[PDB]
Amino acid sequence: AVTYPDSVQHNETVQNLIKSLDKKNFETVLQPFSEFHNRYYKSDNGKKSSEWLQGKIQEIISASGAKGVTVEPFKHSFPQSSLIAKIPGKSDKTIVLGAHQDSINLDSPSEGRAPGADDDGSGVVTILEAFRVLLTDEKVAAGEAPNTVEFHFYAGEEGGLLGSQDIFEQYSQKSRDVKAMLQQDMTGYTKGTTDAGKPESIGIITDNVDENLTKFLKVIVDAYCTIPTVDSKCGYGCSDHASATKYGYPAAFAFESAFGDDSPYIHSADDTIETVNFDHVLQHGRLTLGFAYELAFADSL
């Protein structure tokens, strides 16, 4: 049972950090990430893409001056490893930011083309960029934030939340104190929203999540995003936040749109950068940044 701030406590600091977000870094990383034929978790393709992604995280770390920050693989029974990047803070209360790094072509999983641009390359470059900007803060890079922050890049999500299943089950066993988890899975597709004349917005998934955290998540989107929220259900174990919920951890899920307006190109060769709106991905970078900062600096957690 975990409770959160009623309202944002570091508006000025987060707003200044938001100005450091470089919209060009999304496509820079997303373009080569989507060039792997697929990132199938059972496949050597997914192994190679995981290693490539780990290198890109490491470059952000090496370039940051943050002496204590690490990135490590998390082996699974399949070739594609998950990746956990740790920003250690004063306490062991941990804030997790999630995306999944695999992709699938449901008609030909082993060999089919799956650029996975929106599902879920968009969430990977979203939280990778918020991670980079987070380390430009002196106290965060110094390990003086009240709480620990981790960024997770889950292997094997398209096989049934396989990587996050492994990770959170093991966190549960080793008594890891995960006070808040935010999953981001598809953050780029807005053409379904705008084609219907709906205002572009941040989807907020309301099932398989924690109510208090989802409430705080909306608080974060109102302070730090310049678009509204819309509440949606998806009606099943949508994404990796369901693995966190399964082990009693408070989780939330921010989405590109209302669930019925999301990308129809996922799980096929047609999930391409063409379908991705990076100005919307930038909005998810702002809420990721703000969520991570406000909770890293929440003493009452």
Ligand X SMILES: *[C@@H]1O[C@H](CO)[C@@H](O[C@@H]2O[C@H](CO)[C@@H](O)[C@H](O)[C@H]2NC(C)=O)[C@H](O)[C@H]1NC(C)=O
Residue ranges that bind ligand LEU, judged by CB under 6 A: 119, 157-158, 185-186, 238-239, 262, 266
Taking alpha carbons only, the member of 116, 95, 89 closest to residue 34 is 116
Instruction: Report the site for ligand X in 15-44 (rule: CB under 6 A).
Output: 15
CA nearest to 152, candidates 214, 83, 210: 83
Helices (H), 19-149: 24-33, 44-64, 123-134, 138-141
Residue 152's beta-bridge partner residues? 84, 98
Residue 15 binding partner per list ligand X, ligand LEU, Cl ion, none, with a CB distance cut-off of 5 to 8 Å that depends on partner kind: ligand X
CB of 49 to ligand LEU, least distance (A): 16
11 binds, among ligand X, ligand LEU, Zn ion, none (CB under 5 to 8 A by kind): ligand X
| Contacts of ligand X in 218-277 (CB under 6 A) | 223
Instruction: Give CA 247 to chain center in angstroms.
Output: 19
Between residues 16 and 62, which has the closer beta carbon with respect to ligand X? 16
Min separation Cβ 251 and Cl ion, Å: 12
CB 247 within 8 A of CB 171: yes
Integer Cα distance of 78 and 294 in angstroms: 36
Comparing CA positions, the residue from 292, 96, 247, 280 lying closest to residue 180 is 96
Q: Any binding-site annotation on 270?
A: no
On whether 158 is known to bind a ligand per the annotation, the reply is yes
From the list 1-9, 96-104, 143-151, 284-292, the region that binds Cl ion by CB under 5 A is 1-9
Pick between residue 1 and residue 195 the one whose CB is nearest to Cl ion: 1
Residues 131/293, Cβ–Cβ less than 8 Å? no
**76 labelled as ligand-binding?**
no
Query: In the complex, what is the shortest distance from the CB of residue 101 to ligand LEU, in angstroms, rounded to a whole number?
Result: 12
Stretch that binds Zn ion, among 52-60, 65-73, 112-120, 253-261 (CB under 5 A): 112-120
Nearest to 251, CA basis, from 179, 150, 173:
179
**Which tokens sit at 91?**
């306490």
Q: Is 51 annotated as a binding residue?
A: no
Torsion of CA 126, 129, 131, 135, to 10 degrees: -160
DSSP 3-state of 168? helix
Stretch touching ligand X by CB under 6 A, among 11-19, 166-174, 211-219, 285-293: 11-19
11 binds ligand X (CB under 6 A): yes
Longest Cα–Cα distance in the chain: 49
Q: Measured between alpha carbons, how far apart are the two ends of the chain, in Å?
A: 10
> Residue 97, Cβ neighbours under 10 Å: how many?
27
Q: Using CB distances below 5 to 8 A depending on partner kind, what does residue 119 bind out of Cl ion, ligand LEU, ligand X, none? A: ligand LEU
Of 56-64, 87-95, 115-123, 245-253: span binding Zn ion (CB under 5 A):
115-123
Shortest Å distance, C-beta 160 to Cl ion? 25
CB of 99 to ligand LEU, least distance (A): 10
Which range binds Zn ion by CB under 5 A, 11-19, 147-155, 178-186, 187-195? 178-186
Q: What is the DSSP string of 215-229?
A: HHHHHHHHHH-SS-E
Site of interaction with Cl ion (CB under 5 A): 1
Binding residues for Zn(2+): 100, 119, 158, 185, 267
Site of interaction with Zn ion (CB under 5 A): 119-120, 185
